[PDB]
Amino acid sequence: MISARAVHRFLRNPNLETGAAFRAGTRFDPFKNTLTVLKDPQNGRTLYLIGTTNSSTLLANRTKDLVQKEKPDAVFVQTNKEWWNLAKNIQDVKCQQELNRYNDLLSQAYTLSLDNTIRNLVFKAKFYSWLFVINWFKAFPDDFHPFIPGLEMKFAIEEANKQNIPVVLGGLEVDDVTLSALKVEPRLDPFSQLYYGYRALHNSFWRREHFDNYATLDVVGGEAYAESMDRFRTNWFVKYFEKLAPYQKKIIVDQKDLDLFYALYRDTPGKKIVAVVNQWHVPGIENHWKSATNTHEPLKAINPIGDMDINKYMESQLVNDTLRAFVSKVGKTEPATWKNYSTIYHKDNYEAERVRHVAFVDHKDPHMYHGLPQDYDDNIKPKH
Amino acid sequence: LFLINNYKAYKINTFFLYIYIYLNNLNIIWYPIFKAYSIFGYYKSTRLNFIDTKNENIKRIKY
Amino acid sequence: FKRNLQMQRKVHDILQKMDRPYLRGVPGVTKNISAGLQDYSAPVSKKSQ
């Protein structure tokens, strides 16, 4: 029943020995790291899942053109009513920098409908402290705000309104549903979050990856970094979130991926959907959609020793055994090493531990002379 | 920025900037190579990233 | 040079015609699997010479 395909994999080409102009892959690949086409042949439905980082003007224009020309039967935008009101009252803005100028005003859309009781006040204090710590660990600049919707969402909603097609607002990253989910989990604590976030990069790999990721963010801007965020980088970011806060990652990524899949699969008009969601929900939504509609790419079975050339090893062993027998017969002696090629791991060059291979259990053992030149004929024939 | 642009064409401000620029480029220092290898040895020390992209390093078996 | 060339020809002739018992073994234990040799990587550029 359960299709256990890989969802969040960031390790690209671990079988290549890459480096020095032989890269493991291209991460720029614009217009393809963002748009995914999914199909539901059972109902004949088509979904255009657009994963936006809310930071690039080029991707916003591409999304606007896609909504204009595709003419979907429904548009699913991951915003809310407050943000939509604020953004629709903003006009004559056509570049992402101008909209970044309104980042605080659009961030006012993060409204929490919580009570003023003692428990809710304590929760608000804990949640705000945890948000401050997790933003310290996230460390994104002003021009790269993946969780504050920008021009892509606004263009999608406006083009949906022009065509008079219904618009379904899925809420921001932290909405009432996710706020209640975080309320259920009592694992929010700023100090424990600091301690666990300074222990997330437990080996050098993560550290190095971390560095270069943010290094690029410091060199190229938000617009140039949004284009160069592929599936592998997105999966690395979701896994970094999981290492920082596994419980809040489960609440914010996995559960919201399932909720968005529910909304896109059942709570929608259908037969053509354009869904502009955040970048890091695309893997989960796509995996769920493919599993439910059985539209997974065909399985190519991977034999663990499929890339192992056992014939090479056996041929080398046979060749070196024949060469040892031949040279020993020529020189009227026996082999000195029984190791095909000399390497310093056994220290047999200067210590007393030989690599001689002569094993038998009695005087009648047929395999007594295996490995010795006596095993071969004068024609260097393997037997007798 | 508007004020700074407004006082860009003034001769006194330009004179101060000119003095600043002149003092900036006044002290240009030369750092020689004092090892016996000199220029060619240093140049050969800076060839690591480009050795593998050369014809003599192409896999070319005699037999 | 001449004698070494003759000896090398002799040795190569010995190695070409020698019996290879590993070709009669179990695939995946003493032989390549029945499918063959596979590459599971996804290269993005030509490997250097």
């Binding site: 014939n311 041929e315 | 005699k62 037999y63 | 060339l5 090398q8 020809r9 190695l15 290879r20």
Partner: peptide, 17 residues
């Protein structure tokens, strides 16, 4: 296999030095 035999036999070819 005959193809593998051909390849491995081609591995040991003395050049006309």
């Amino acid at each position: 296999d005959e193809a593998y035999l051909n390849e491995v036999r081609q591995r040991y070819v003395t050049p006309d030095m």
